[PDB]
């Protein structure tokens, strides 16, 4: 009548019989140890850089226990509920016999966070002189309050490596001379083994490991305010934005979708000239047309005024800044702060010829516009040259975010007075000692050859994944991601539970852009974020 | 394997006690509690409309049977052993109809023909409570296979005695569903461990190309969504078409981005070539369209109505009227770019639009399906005598120029080639297909179709990863909608998709696509039409 | 009628999704004909020793329609569909503290 | 409940009362024993003529393992897919107590191919005498890499025989002194048993053995470029042909189905005079009509001249060469090198009587006819009975193939410049010491009387298979095929991985045409195909 | 000098990739300073 | 003769079983099957 | 199992043996003069 898990009319199959030997005995071609090629060797969880700069104390690696360590264990957890057991570790430094410096590691018990101080060293540790050749293997025991910790669980028995004895070389002279590269290899403990398993494609009621956010490679980064990939990194006192912005609670900060699509909107022929905006065909916000930029106009002005720019132009790279030349009316371009789009055109009532595509987010008052930091149904903007008749409707909409209007050295959306708030503009005041950041981006200009920057709040892949999965992260806790280039410069970014990024540095600029990036888990918000620049 | 010294961290773990306990409170008993329970693979419903003998489930022995094995496979390379398969039958006791299964040895591809039963087979029936299961024996030459191996002792189920629904005979009666679960056989066991991100010498297991969700289906010709279904006895177009050997006659990368290229302006508006700027093909735009122009043509003042307004369902037929036409407009074959000017000449207000591919003799254009660096043209106006352009550039497709019912993509003459074109005609009893796609027209609101060679998120894959496949068997993917219809596509080396049917109709658009690894081109692809 | 229902014991810390994949998990099939009412237990797997009254994160059980519900006289409207009940009794090994 | 492929409820005949022990007597009728009597006796395979003029060391049986040996097995194998074990081989000679000489026996392991040299003997062998009346019977043990041999495995154990010591004869002297024959039988070894039972109709994942191309019989052969039966061979250094030529991977550079049928095309009545350029009606090659001839005119000739001369008729055979003399000429006649063909005229609107047809492939600009070598839907000219200026259009229907225009002794298809390619140029150079051939066919002429022939690349029946089948061959191993006339002459032909015919002689000659062929298998093209011709 | 180097026994059927991850596999390190050479074995993992 | 350390590559070969088997299916019996058969040097008449 | 002296392996021999394991006596095919330098081009054609 019923159907207990696995049972029922069994039969094998026609001339079917899996009769060992041919199976089992087909193992001969291997020499296999057990059903765990896992516990047998180690992998490369990661490698840290050690330079003649950092001073005796600063911790170099602060990893916490959990399958996230060894990759195969990692690649398996995607099938289980919780784990248990220790993890054998082997690490070694790849330095040169000309160097000099000791290093020690310690197994910090669950519940405490190390401190960049020598005293913290007094504890059963393992030295490792820079000259050491044969690597050293020790174990990370599973000291656990519970019977087993399931996937997440932050309070694991963490490991750590700090500078026991400053590393120096008998060759001073230059700046950040050099250093050596260290590496940590993990091996699944002999007493480690998972436990109950997960039902494929299920969601962990307590969030997943946030570590997976941004691309482990610069190249295909790109922002959210705009599609152009990240150009540089900029730091400021405060950071505000919302449109292509998402949060850990997946709160719709803005009104657009996690990606980029051609803004398409119908409109009515204002019977005048520059026509009436407001419709919003393909959008998930009553009115507010997903895709509209966070920028508007700063000074109320008329859409009328052809040919403005500065002066003649051609005398490019003419270090401006005003004060006080009289010839190149720097700034003004009649109607700046605009959004040039590749529009389709209208249609319906027929006869026409593309063009147009100059928008903003203000308000329609015949010949004037006048801004507003508040965006509602009837606030979008456009431009035209679709001569009036009987006044037909349903336009051929569409257009794409392409250009802006050469204001000045102002990186797009550099001020609150510019940000098109929808309801609540989420900012970000420094935490602990760290400072918020921004993602510099490029944006094509309109009158000039090529120019102007744009401030982005978060990488596209960030917003993307942030609006789908669910990663539980404490309130006052970050998200440790190590970014690096090629020269040797390395720092961290701790994502905020609000969707922002932080760093603990004063200023950086000149770096081999072809970067890379990983994640070292997540630490508190107060503690800073060491780094290496200059 | 273990090289190096070893040291304690004064607080070492007392193995047993802990871990040798946790399990207890974990219920965790069967170490590999994933090799003692049946999972669930696919589940296709069997109906009465099904004619006796149509294969209902042709699958080959491999780790692609069970999910675990599947997600576990990514770690290894070798595998030997059998896999069990349980089927659950659900259908009113009143029913009748037997289904028979069969085990085909490695070296033979399953045929829809009734001849199958001419081989030892089993007899399974619907009215049976307790489900039936049986092992899929692993007969092999080698001592174990690498994931590249597709030919093995495979299993299949066919409709013996037609499904019978007593009191049906009308407007709906339905069929009955029957699932398929799998359990990793005891004799089974993986072998060689694959080194992270390793490359399988002879390709991969081509079965991921066509994404699972229909919504994520863009065309290789347009940043637009699939939308549907056309079939033709002859197909082609290598505009953005790739091959299994990553080789492509195209000139554009899978991606769909803006078209950045300099220009040329004397003081006769048009002309211009742009050329050389951000491409992987000597002086050829990485986003430049295809179809050129049907005739010679030159630019012409403004638009050409062709035929008034309020032209609907009393139109679309060519010359549906005397004070009519459905052709002339003077740029009837121009792709609507995303107009945008750069500068140098500086003085603005420019938003061009028209940009097909031809020649530039003053005001003359003339077509050619030959794409020489010097054949890319534009539409513009600079206005101030001398020169210095580097103007326009940065554009992006939008629409096309209003025409008649000739969807762009069926005229082998109006197709730009780089030298050779990807030819593909009916191979046996299967037919070549195309991917219909909507495209914003340049006047009549939204309209006209456009064919595509392969789904976008498809080529992306072929364009990069290396896959395994004999140019004698096209990999298969199962497509199903939300109603009850479904068919099969069999991408062939060349990179096209095929179908064993003659013509399919409209259907509930929510589409899900799976895969059956692959089949030989010598046979058709069953389906559930109407 | 004909049709089958699935039974699955979801461990703590995970939350069941209304998808199919849920079934690629050890389950217990269940038929619509079976007049005999099924009675199994949701064993308590725990992290701690004793569960604090508020612990909202515990073992869990769920039911999903394995195979649709078929009916020989299909046609129009919401054809039909029977009800299903669910009773409860404190397990033997269940005791407070 | 269920049921296995045999189980079920039996009932027993009705009047089969008596449905038993009947075959009791029937068994006597044929006194047969084991249902496998063939697995017992010996079957003939082949025999060779060992001549006294045959120098020391010379192969005689390159025969290899595989059920392809014995006919019974070979036949039975049609029902399986798996075979293993060895095959016994009994064979002997009929030597006279006078003669003297020794033959060698050697079991060549898989993966190697025996060479007709002496060194072969510096291998463990078994000597064999000409006197021994006792027929020898040893076995070719199957050494294998795999477990079971896939039907097609052409790489297996092998056995061979080589003349150890010449054949001496006390009454030497002149001519081919003498030489006795030697036979060879076969019986399936005991340890030889199949394994995998294929289901009828299923399709094998690989491909059958290529020993099934050429028909065993010279009779039905016929060229592939022309429907006439072959009547000679062409020993050439190069070969080229795409039209109706197929590759081994079933691909074809060609443009036409492997068969000869009438060519139906629709040409648009030019209104003026002769036109040409008429696209096909139904063919598996866009534009290029399936069946349309091969070459094109070797010069910019025009369409005209009635019974244009090429002088002297009745002056039969004073012909050939370069016009032989002033008065007598060898080639002009305007539309020379043209394919003649009866043709049924359409009629469109009206006007009767078929009337003409003279075709080829070239560009028809004006009333000229320049030759194109590259074939596209724009080069299909002809000759007609258009007439009447109403500009009546879309004339004709069909036309076949009968002749061509007497271009001297030019066996059509002997120059690349004359063969028309669709894009590629399928060919083959002298691989190994082997040379490529053609198949001297025969093509009727017109203006003259009756004469001249034309080459050919694949024996039609071949291409036919190539396109309809799918085999497996080493890109370095031909397809050994034996040919034999009515005397004794015999030689081998091979098949290129592309599909061409090769020979191991520098020149072959005249031989009785009641020819018949056969198939051996595959041999590295690096070895010459022996032959007893000349 | 200064620099480590590692070797790995790739199984038949796969082709290595110039990437660090490819390193995660049972390997053998060999610091540039290493003096005493190292001996390991290349097993005959064979299908046939 | 052997100088230097020694390390495993986690997947070491189980000598016997394999190689101590191959021969079987190789007919290979007489280890030095080239010291138990006569070859062939010259041959003058 | 062993090979019979001077036999050809039905499946090709190891290609590795081609060119001289020493420059000096290299020399080309279009001409006898030994190789002078190395040049690279988009396409390469030849046949004699």
Per-chain topology:
This is part of a larger assembly, with seven copies of chain A.
Chain A: E1 46-51, E2 59-61, H1 71-77, E3 87-94, E4 104-107, E5 125-127, E6 136-140, E7 159-162, E8 179-188, E9 203-204, E10 230-235, E11 339-341, E12 358-359, E13 401-403, E14 435-442, E15 453-456, H2 460-466, E16 480-484, E17 490-494, E18 502-503, E19 516-517, E20 531-532
Antiparallel strand pairs in A: 1-8, 2-7, 3-6, 3-8, 4-5, 4-7, 10-14, 11-12, 11-13, 14-15, 14-18, 16-17, 16-19, 17-20
Commentary on this structure:
Chain E: This is Capsid protein VP1. The structure is cut from a larger assembly and holds seven copies of chain A. The first copy, chain A, has 534 residues and is mostly beta strands. Helix content of chain A is 3%, strand content 16%. Chain A has two helices and 20 strands. Chain A is globular, with a radius of gyration of 30 Å. The termini of chain A are far apart. Chains in contact: A-B, A-C, A-D, A-E, A-F, B-C, B-D, B-E, B-F, D-F, D-G, E-F, F-G. The A-F interface holds A 28-33, 37, 40-41 and F 10-14, 17-18, 21.
């Amino acid at each position: 009548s019923i159907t207990t898990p696995e049972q029922g009319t069994t039969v094998g199959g026609v001339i079917a019989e899996p009769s060992v030997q041919m199976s089992a005995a087909a193992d001969m071609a291997t020499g296999k140890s057990v059903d765990s090629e896992w516990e047998a060797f180690f992998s490369f969880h990661t490698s840290v850089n050690w330079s003649t700069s950092e001073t005796q104390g600063k911790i170099l690696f602060k990893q916490s226990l959990g399958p996230l360590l060894n990759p195969y264990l990692t690649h398996l957890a995607k099938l289980y509920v919780a784990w248990s057991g220790s993890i054998e570790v082997r690490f070694s430094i790849s330095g040169s016999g000309v160097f000099g410096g000791k290093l020690a590691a310690i197994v910090v018990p669950p519940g405490i966070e190390p401190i960049q101080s020598t005293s913290m060293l007094q504890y059963p540790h393992v030295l490792f002189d820079a000259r050491q050749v044969e690597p050293v293997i020790f174990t990370i025991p599973d000291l656990r309050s519970t019977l087993y910790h399931l996937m997440s669980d932050t309070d694991t028995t963490s490991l750590v490596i700090m500078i026991y004895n400053d590393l120096i070389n008998p060759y001073a002279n230059d700046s950040n001379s050099s250093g050596c590269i260290v590496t940590v290899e993990t091996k699944p403990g002999p007493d480690f083994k998972f436990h109950l398993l997960k039902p494929p494609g299920s969601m962990l009621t307590h969030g997943s490991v946030p570590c997976d956010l941004i691309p482990k490679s610069s190249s295909l980064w790109i922002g959210n305010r705009f599609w152009s990939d990240i150009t540089d990194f900029v730091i400021r006192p405060f950071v505000f934005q919302a449109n292509r912005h998402f949060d850990f609670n997946q709160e719709t900060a803005g009104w657009s979708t996690p990606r980029f699509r051609p803004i398409t909107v119908t409109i009515s022929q204002k019977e005048g000239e520059m026509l009436g905006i407001g419709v919003a065909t393909d959008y998930i916000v009553p009115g507010i047309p997903d895709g509209w930029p966070d920028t508007t106009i700063p000074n109320e002005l008329i859409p009328a005024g052809d040919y403005a720019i500065t002066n003649q132009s051609g005398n490019d790279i003419q270090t401006k800044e005003e004060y006080e030349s009289a010839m190149i009316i720097s700034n003004n371009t009649n109607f700046k702060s605009m959004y040039i789009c590749g529009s389709l055109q209208r249609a319906w009532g027929n006869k026409k010829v593309s063009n147009t595509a100059f928008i903003t987010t203000a308000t329609v008052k015949e010949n004037k516009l006048i801004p507003s930091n508040t965006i509602d149904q009837t606030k979008i903007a456009i431009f035209q040259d679709n001569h009036v008749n009987r006044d037909v409707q349903t336009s051929d909409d569409t257009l794409a975010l392409l250009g802006y209007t050469g204001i000045g050295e102002e990186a797009i959306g550099a001020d609150r007075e510019k940000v098109v708030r929808i309801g609540v503009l989420p900012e970000a005041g420094a935490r602990g000692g760290n400072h918020p950041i921004f993602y510099r981006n490029s944006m094509k200009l309109g009158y000039v050859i090529k120019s102007i920057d744009v401030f982005n709040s978060q990488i596209l892949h960030t917003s993307r994944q942030l609006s789908l999965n669910n990663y539980l992260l404490s309130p006052d806790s970050f998200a440790v991601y190590r970014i690096i280039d090629s020269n040797g410069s390395w720092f961290d970014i701790g994502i905020d539970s609000d969707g922002f990024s932080f760093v603990g540095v004063s200023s950086i600029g000149k770096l081999e852009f072809p970067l890379t990036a990983s994640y070292m888990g997540n630490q508190l918000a107060k503690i800073r974020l060491a780094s290496n620049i200059r």
